[PDB]
Each structure stands twice: as C-alpha cells, then as structure tokens.
Amino acid sequence: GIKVFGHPASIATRRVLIALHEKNLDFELVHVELKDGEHKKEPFLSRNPFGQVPAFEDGDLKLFESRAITQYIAHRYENQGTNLLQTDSKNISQYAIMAIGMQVEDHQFDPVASKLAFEQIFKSIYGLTTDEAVVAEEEAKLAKVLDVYEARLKEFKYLAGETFTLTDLHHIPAIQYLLGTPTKKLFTERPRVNEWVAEITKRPASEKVQ
Amino acid sequence: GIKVFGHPASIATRRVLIALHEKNLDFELVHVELKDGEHKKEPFLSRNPFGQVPAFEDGDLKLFESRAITQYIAHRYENQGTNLLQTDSKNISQYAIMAIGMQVEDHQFDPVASKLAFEQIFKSIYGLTTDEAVVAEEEAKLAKVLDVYEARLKEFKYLAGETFTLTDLHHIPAIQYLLGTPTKKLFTERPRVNEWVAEITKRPASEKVQ
Amino acid sequence: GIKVFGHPASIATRRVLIALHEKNLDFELVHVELKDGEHKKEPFLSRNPFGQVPAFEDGDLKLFESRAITQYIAHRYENQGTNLLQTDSKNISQYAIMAIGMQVEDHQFDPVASKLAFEQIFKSIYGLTTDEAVVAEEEAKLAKVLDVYEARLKEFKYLAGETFTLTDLHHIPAIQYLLGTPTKKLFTERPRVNEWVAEITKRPASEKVQ
Amino acid sequence: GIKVFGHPASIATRRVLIALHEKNLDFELVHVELKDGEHKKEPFLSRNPFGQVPAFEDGDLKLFESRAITQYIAHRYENQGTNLLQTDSKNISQYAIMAIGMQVEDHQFDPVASKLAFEQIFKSIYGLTTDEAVVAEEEAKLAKVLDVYEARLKEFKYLAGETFTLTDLHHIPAIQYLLGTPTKKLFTERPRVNEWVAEITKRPASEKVQ
Amino acid sequence: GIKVFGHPASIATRRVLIALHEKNLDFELVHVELKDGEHKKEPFLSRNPFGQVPAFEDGDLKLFESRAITQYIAHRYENQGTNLLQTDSKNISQYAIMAIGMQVEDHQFDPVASKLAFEQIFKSIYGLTTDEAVVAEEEAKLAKVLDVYEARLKEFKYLAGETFTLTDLHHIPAIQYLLGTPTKKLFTERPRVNEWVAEITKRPASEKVQ
Amino acid sequence: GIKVFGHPASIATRRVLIALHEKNLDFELVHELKDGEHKKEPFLSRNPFGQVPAFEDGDLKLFESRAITQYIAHRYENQGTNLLQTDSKNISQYAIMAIGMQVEDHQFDPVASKLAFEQIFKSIYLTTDEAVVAEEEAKLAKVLDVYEARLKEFKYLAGETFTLTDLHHIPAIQYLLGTPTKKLFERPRVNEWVAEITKRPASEKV
C-alpha cells in the first residue's frame, strides 16, 4: 500500500499527509526517529540519500521530496476526493499559473516562514533563546511577500485561480505553526490573506495533521 | 509571439533560454536593465511582483519563475525539437522520478552552486574580495551533494532516467559558470558526474547561451 | 503539591524532571503547548515573564529557570532520595567546587552542545537543512571543552568530586540528545568522559525522561 | 591569603573585586598579562583550564569562574561586612528567589549588555569601527529585558527582595561600562531601573573598581 | 604603451579608466575574463598576486591596486589634460588635505557603497535575492557618512578644496552604480552632495566609462 | 606644536606615534573612549567620523592615521629617518611604495586586526571564537605567502629601504606577536622582516 516515512511534527511530512487526507486515501505513517539520528543512517538513506523526511512509498514506487510527492498524489489519484490540480487539469496555461505559485511558495514564502516558526516555536521547545532581531528582520520580509499575496488574492479566490490547489495546500503546515505565534498579526492585518488563511486552515484535512 | 524579459548573464534567464533553444523556438530576448533598477519598478513589477528576472510572455499568457516557465515550454511545445519531458511523457511514476530531481536541483544544488559562482566570479567582476572561507565551506557541501549525484548517475545515464530531461537542463547555467573556476575540480574528480557535465554543457542549445 | 510547567522534549524541563525523579518525588507535569504559542502569552508569562519553559510550583512557591529549580530541589528535599549536593553539604569550599562546575556547564558546555543538538536533530524534525559547516565549527569547540573535562575526570570520579552532583546532572539532557548523533564520537573517543557519560545516562532517573 | 588572578578592566574580574570590597576583605590583585597571551599558557591554565580571567585563591582553595567565586565569598565570609545573601540566609525559598535573578543576569542581561559595551567601548579603544546595526539590534533586546526588570523592581526594592544581594551585585561591572555610552538612555528612561542603577553604582565598593 | 588589465564593469577598473580619460591618454583596455577564472590563474597572478582587477602597465612599469595607479597617473602625466592633484601640487599641507579625503573614501564610503551596489544591482543580474535588511542597515550607515560629506561640501566646492581632485574622482564609479538604485534618494536629499554628484558624474571622462 | 589626540593602545594611534618617533619629533599625546569622548564634541570637530587618532600641527588639523603618517613623512622629510623612498621625488618608486601601503590597508589590516581582536581584546574585557581565528589565520597565511615572495626579491616591501609601507604594519604585528598567530610569521623572509621592523627603537617606544 501507501507508506509515508516521516515525523508528524515535520512541515514537509505534514504537506504530504494533508494531500493524502484531501484525497481520502489510506496510508501508514511510519515514524522515523530523528531523535536517534535514524534519518542520517541506513536504511533510510536508501529511501532518501539526502537524509531528510519525508520519504514515501506507493507499492513498488519509491519517492522523496514533499512537493514532488504531493504532485504525484494529485495526478495518480486525480479522480478521488478533492481535486488538487486545476479544474481543467490538462490545460497547459492553467497548469503553468499553478506551477508559478508552487514555485513562489518554495522560494519566497517557505524560507522566511520556516525561519520565523523555528525561531519563535522550535527553539523554545528545546531550550534556546529566540533571537528577537532575526524575528523582526524576517517579519519585515514576510510582510512584503504577503503584500504581493494580498494583491494576488484580490484578483482570485485562491492563488492559482478560482479553486483550491496544490499551490495553496503547500503553505498550510508552515502557516499552522505561525498561527500560534505573534506573526499571526501579519496574516490577520491583511484582509484577503486572512480570509484565505482561515479557509485553508479550517479544512478537515488540514485539521487532521495539527 | 514569445518574449523573455531578462538579462543574458542571469542563471534563471539562461535556464529559460536553453529550453527555448532546445525546442527550436523563435523568441525575442527583451533586455531588462537591472543596472538602472528596472526590475524593482513598474512596468516590470506587473510581469513579476517579486521583481526578479526572468519574466516571460507567450502571446496573451504572462509567466514568471524560471522552472515554471521551462515546464510550460516542455509541455506546450512537447512535439517540437528535443523532448524535455520523459520519453513516456504521460507516465505518472516516471514524471514523479523527474520531479524529484527537479526538486533536488532547487534545494540541494542551486543554493550552494550559486553561492560558489557568486563568491568566485561575480564578486571579482565588481570589485569585492572573494571569501576563501565561504568558498571552502560551500565546496565541502557541494562535494557531499555531488557524491549523491555520482551514485545516482552510476545507475542511470541522466538524472531522471535514460534520457536528458528538465532535471538535467536546470543545472546547466550554474555549472557553466562553475567550470570557469577551481570548483571544476569537484566535477572532474567524479567520473560519472564529469561525463554528465561534459554531455549537457556540450549540447548546442547550452552553448548558444554562454 | 509539586507542578512542573513545561514540555517533555525540552532540555531545561528534563533537567528539572531528572532532579525530581532522583529525589523520588511525586509531581504533575503540566504540558505547556508551545506549538500554540502558550509560553509567550498569559497566564504563563505570570509564571515566567521571559516566556521560557520550564516554570515550577511547590505549593505556594512559584519558580522558573531550570538550574535555580534543581538547586531548590537539592536543598528543600535534601534528606530524601539521592543526594544532589556534595556529601558534606554544608562545607563552603566543597560547595564552591560544585558551583564552578555548574557555572562551567552553563557557559562552556551548554551553548555549544545545544547548538549541535539543534542543528542535527531539531532542524531535521521540522524540515530545515543541517548546516554541515556550523556542526564542524561547534564540534571543534566541544572537543576542546571535552579535553578539559577529560583532564578533570582523570583526577575525580565525577566533576565536583567523588559523588554524583547537580554539576553532573545538569549535563544529562543535552548529552542524551547528542548520543543520537555522530557527535557521540567526541564523547566516546575520550576514555574517562565516555565512562562518565555512560554512568550518568544509565541512571534510572535519567532513563525516565528519555 | 586571598589572591585574585585577573585584569582590572575585566567585567568578570570586577564582579569578584566588588564582592571582596563589599566584604571589607584584604586581597592581592595579581595582574594577568592578557596582552602577552598569559591566560592561554601555563601556569594560568592550571588555575583555569578554559583560559579565562579571573582565577582565584583563598589559601589552599583554588577557584575560577566569577559567579561561583562571588557565591563562595558571600558564604565563607558571611558575618563580615555587607550581607550579600538574603537577610534570612538559610531560608531555601528566599535563596531560590535570589538564584533565579542570578540565573536571569547570566542568561538574559549579560550576553546583550556585554555585546553593547564591547561594540561601543572596547572596539573603539583598539581601533575597529562600531557596528551601528548590531548596537541597535541589541539595544532593542536590552530594552525588552529592562522592561521585565522595571516590572520586577516595581514590586521590590532590589531584584531578590528588600535587600541588595549577589543578584544585583553581578550586574554592576557591565552597567558601569554601559553608563559611559548612549545605552544609558535605556536605564534612565525607566524610573525604578534608573533608581536601582543609581543606588548600586553609587556604592563605595562599586566605585573602588571603576 | 599604456595597458589596463581589467573588466569594464569593475569599479576599481573604472576608477583607473576615468583618470586615464581625464588625462587625455591613449591606452589599451585588455579584458580579463573573470568568468573563466582568469584573474585567479597565471599569468595574471604575475601582474597582481592577490588576483584582483585591475592590473596596469606603462611600458616597463607594472602596477596593480587602483588608488595607487590613479596617483601614479596624476603625477607621471601631471602637465597633461585635467589636473588631478591640487592646484599647488607640490604644497605638502594641501596634499595632506587631499590624502585625508582619499583615505576617507576608502575607509568610510567604499565599503558601504559597494555593498549597497552589490546587494541591489549585481545580485539581481546573476539571480540572487536582494536582502532588504542589509540594504536598510547600510543605507543608514551611508546616510551618516553623507551628512559628514554635506558639512564638508558646505565649506568647499570639492572635497579636497576649490578644485576637482583624485579625492572626488575615486568616488565616481560606485556613485554611478548607486544612481540606478533607490539609494540615489540619499544623494538627492542632501543639497551640496547632490550638486557635487551631479558635477562629477556629468564630466565627459566619467560618462566615457558608463 | 604637534598634538596627537588618541589612545596609547590604539593601532591607528600607534601607527602615527611610531612615525613621529622615527622623525625624532616632539609632541603631546592628548588622551577617554571609555567615557565615550570620541563620539561627542569637541572631538567630532577634529574627526566627524568619531575615531582616533585626530592630529594637530599648529593650525593644521588632520585625522586618519595613514594620511597623517604621509604628512609627517613629507613635512618633516629632512629630519630623522627617511620614511619615503631614497629617491623621494621619483614618481615610479613612489607608486611602488603606494601599492604596498594600499595592500596593507586592504589585504593585511582587516584580517590581522580581526585576529588581534578575537585573541587579545576580547580576552581583556568575551570568549575567543576559535572558528573565526582559524578562518582568518588561513586568510592571513595566503596573504603572508604573497609577502614572502615579495620579500624574497627586496629587503623591504617598497624596495631596499624601510618606508611607510613597512611602518604601517607594525602596531598590528606587535599585538599578533603575543599570540599563537606568531607561528605564521614559519616564513623565513617574513620572519626576518618582522624582527627588523619590530626591533626598531621607535617601534619599541610605543
């Protein structure tokens, strides 16, 4: 069957889990003990030689890298559950529009957002002091990025068009984490972003991985 | 027709240009004067609100972000010139394998490679001193990455399988730059990588953008 | 009764838990949801205005800061379970010797060790890439620190003298995490350090918090 | 007799010197020539293997690490001069309160304050340019920390209660340095902090080390 | 004859080219292919062992380092074209005044200005994201520096006195680059600076290298 | 007369003091960075960038150490040691000296000063960063190899005579000699050069 080799707290792992749930699919979440360094030793390195979670299995097919896995799910299980591709899924122009947003989340949003979530949650869990200077710097960054998102969301219900797609889905785990932190201010202060956040984080598949 | 709004030295712009040439397509390269800050002002911000090159046009369709653009080219002009997708282009498993590698270039290769190319070439052009410490740090990184590439290339002719694909194409511009620098050692000292580099950089479409 | 307001993965929280277990004390571990930003909001800020875990309660007495809490435990519940102070607990010279080591763990060991554990474990769990350069830098640091520990442990069974004390206890949570990482090499390669690590990590109270 | 092995400009050394003076004790200040790298060679490494000042001697007893030394002084010479412990010195609850504050100075105050003092004073002495960006970053930090101090000092005359203690003493050397810098603004602009600074820096023992 | 071994985009190379043009001299600009790492290999290392552009030749005389080369030009070809030294060129007091300004450009202006120009232009050309935080930090710096320039220019037509000298010349290439960036605001907002910029950048020799 | 407004521990201030001593000149060393004097008036009227040293020779008001040493070298040329080239008006030979001066400022000083600071000045007040030390030592090593090659062809950096080019290195080198970085200075012709210039009476006075 389908197996996800990861960790339930992992943003990348959650990104995959949401897509599976969105597709009403049954799978086994095989826990990788990162705490014991399992990810940096065999046999996990045979599933992903870069030693990051998640790795993935669908029968004989062996994948890693979360965005590639969500895409695979979106296509292989297209007719099942929520459509994660564009309504007209074979339309090349419309796919490109979606692809740009996917690309934007990876390059503009994730690095900043993940740094924020890490400085202000994960640090605190393990026992290091949050760097207020870093937080401020990255908040200023994310603010400028979210202004671009606001403009985009003023012209379309979701980022790739009129429907919820992979483009939106990929943001969810990081946003979830940032909503338990003062950085929520940036999402809330922007009307169309705030509505978008609220719609995508309130989805049942999104709540299943919290 | 087709317009590319970018700069001929730009890695991301070159990534798009190679794909166009590989597809034997005719296009106009519209030069964006980054030197005069054109990219950070209208009307370029209407083509890409994040203010990076390249932006792209195919008739009425307006894109940005290089990897999204190359994918669009690969699909919209699939029949034409070199096949940039997998031989069996509609096969979902085989697409996923390609998608992983595309993902790997973006996350594991590009950040390190670009930093190297920048510290060693672009700094020198302008007049800043190369940081020998940074170079060494990143070379150690890229080495570990390229070992994973060696292992992969021992099992397959190219990164996504038996054929040259987008996965390989996306590496070219950065590699081109690094070949004029002592970092070439890392590519040469690895047999299957060295052959792979040599095959992809010697392609006519790759040379047209040097 | 006794309540610990923290998180079970937290190094500082574990430091307190071990001292409680070592004293055979009964307590409630009240989970603080850092993931929902509980620590940076009231009413937790009334228990610790710097918004870090753990906070602590012993009836009416409200404390924070792990080393202060372990000291309090060591004194208030002195006659009970393991002695965490020096054998001659009222001896001022012997206390000072212990105090130096406590001070050393805080200043020389913890910052480096925690950075290591964070770069290698906690980063991987959330989905950020380990910085191999940082790991190397800090491993070189810890090595130099652990050489000083080796010399010290060659003259005494434990760090403060012939008995296990707070000085040793405070190191445990960080060491536990580092034992599931290639940084174990540094502890193992040093004979008396390795014996010391093995003795303190194998204690029942130490294992209860793993 | 009593020897302090250090340097008169050293914050950590001054911390010890103030405690000795506060206790009306006689001692020899043995100057360590850090300029000639004395601290990183024998025989100083036999007094402190981590090669930092100050080291300390009280007859046969050999100590290092300033906070451990001040605590030792506070206890060994308890009935002499100023009481540096709590009025009810054997009270375990009241000690813990003091211990928290000691812990807070070390973790929250000292790293920021010392960076400030270093960027603004020590850099200028030797001939490096002050980084205005760093100054600003750290001033923002210290401000937030000092707000917590303000709140605390609104409820108590000194940090550990109604009396001057080690908790307060340990702040003095760093504060002295910062008072000759625009960072004084942060101390002055906060009423109860300003009163506290003025009281502790005006003490005769505090002036003796300026 | 005279040869300049450099690159036309290089600030340091331009600094030399302007001085040559200002002196109406004929020379060959020999292009060093930094892109192919020519600067870090022989035979260029025989012209400058630190591997930076520009190197320089005047018959048998072999020089490197731009400010030394411009000085050499200013003296060796003193009676030709524009006077780049002070009107009373042998006056030791007046030379010292010029020398201070030359020193000021190197230490106070260039490092900041070059970072700005690099973060905003050169990064964008090659494909890295501008760090807005860095930009802001350095803009604050340059502003303070330019206030000192404003005060100076209120008392004198140019930086070294009543005439255009090397002191002014050396600023040109960096200023040229910054004029195509929002950092122009800092120059425009200061009256005497703005006039100075406008005069020196509008000189025919300055325009020849744009 | 001549005043130097600085601090005796300051590298830049020492650079000026050595040049004055080398020229057998009499001056007053006017001393408080500790009380933030450098960042307030009236010092800002002597140097608006708020760094030491500032300098006075009668009515003439200077700042910036390399500019001051050059001024000394020229205004008091016939007095004491010659700090310019033997043929002081020769434009080719001046340029050779100027390159070296430029090299010290750009290639040597930033690295050397970071080293001296991480290893000495930090310790006087903060923990030395062993990683930084190593990074910068690798840098300085490469720089000093270039110096070795240069010193193999000439007695001093600008030619056959001791000049400003050499002088400007002294204060930083002095500090680095009390530190394990001395090891790097393992380079024969560099070692001899360091020994000659640091043993000079004017060098020892500061």
Ligand SMILES: C1=CS/C(=C2\C=Nc3ccccc32)N1
């Ligand atoms: C696709 C065409 S234009 C576009 C976007 C334009 N602004 C965006 C912000 C977030 C995600 C996507 C966009 N995406």
Ligand SMILES: C1=CS/C(=C2\C=Nc3ccccc32)N1
């Ligand atoms: C697709 C399935 S496994 C895999 C790879 C496994 N190692 C790789 C290195 C570079 C690019 C791709 C890979 N790619």
Ligand SMILES: C1=CS/C(=C2\C=Nc3ccccc32)N1
């Ligand atoms: C107490 C007196 S001397 C001393 C130490 C001397 N070296 C140490 C290394 C780790 C912990 C403690 C020490 N501790």
Ligand SMILES: C1=CS/C(=C2\C=Nc3ccccc32)N1
């Ligand atoms: C002890 C119980 S609560 C507490 C503090 C609560 N806020 C503080 C700020 C500086 C030093 C100590 C404190 N100290």
Ligand SMILES: C1=CS/C(=C2\C=Nc3ccccc32)N1
């Ligand atoms: C020479 C004596 S004071 C002085 C300057 C005082 N402020 C300046 C700013 C830019 C260039 C030179 C100066 N130059």
Ligand SMILES: C1=CS/C(=C2\C=Nc3ccccc32)N1
């Ligand atoms: C002048 C022509 S070549 C040259 C140098 C060539 N290498 C150097 C190292 C330190 C100082 C000067 C030089 N200086």
